[PDB]
């Protein structure tokens, strides 16, 4: 119910770690009043241009997430308020998961992928819980706290202006009528897998975003991962139905990732 405020002595910024649209995100310490401890974590900026009813979407999906949570979706800590709107979560240390993927191409394992393919899909699954629809996931927006534990963050959504996309990430009804659901989610998350089984290839490289919706139609995709067995291709491609109640459920993403990570050499074939 409550939510935790911090003061501005208990945090510290040592460096920039990047920044968007809505603020600028610093790493930093924090030191709670009262306890000899210090905590490593990430603290968000909001823009001070921005106006009050833009912002507010921003704080209230973080009040959804407020009792136990996941594990594999990102925890608000709590918030302080300066002149600026401060949030506050803990470190991931090893940063987002494509820039790892990439720079971790030679000594990846089949095991590390298909668990990384599992945690987001429990992650996912708990967001649906809540009811919170992301509208942005990608390899981008999930976070490594280590090579065995990641973390979806950057949640979604639309600027609102007084007035004074991720178009090959988004499925086809996303593009021509911007309806953004669980399901839209599903389809995302193909791309995201599709991210990590090419070691981050970018996805329709070369192809303007212009041409993507007539090529979905006609019933062109993603290619199958050098790596990937069919039987994992298989699930990327019914993530990617026109038809959006024949998409895969996130639970039964889980199930069946749970299941290839059991035996992931079957599956995926790594050269080492
Ligand atoms: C990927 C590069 C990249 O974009 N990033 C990696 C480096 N940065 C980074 N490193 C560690 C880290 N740890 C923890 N948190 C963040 N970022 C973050 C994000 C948000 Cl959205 C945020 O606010 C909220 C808001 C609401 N909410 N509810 C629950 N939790 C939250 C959090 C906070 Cl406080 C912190 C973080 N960031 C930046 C990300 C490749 N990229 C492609 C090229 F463009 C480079």
Redesign the pocket.
Known sequence: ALLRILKETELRKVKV??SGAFGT?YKGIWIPDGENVKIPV???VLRENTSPKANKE?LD??YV?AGVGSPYV???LGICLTSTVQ??????PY??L??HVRENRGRLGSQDLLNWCMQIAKGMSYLEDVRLVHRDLAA?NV?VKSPNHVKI???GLARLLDIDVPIKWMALESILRRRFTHQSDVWSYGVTVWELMTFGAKPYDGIPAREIPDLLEKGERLPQPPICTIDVYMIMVKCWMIDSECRPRFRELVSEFSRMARDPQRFVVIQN
């Open positions: 770690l990047g995100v990430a603290i968000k921003i999906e973080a997430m990102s925890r608000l949030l506050v979560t803990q470190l991931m940063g987002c494509l820039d981008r976070l963050t950057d949640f």
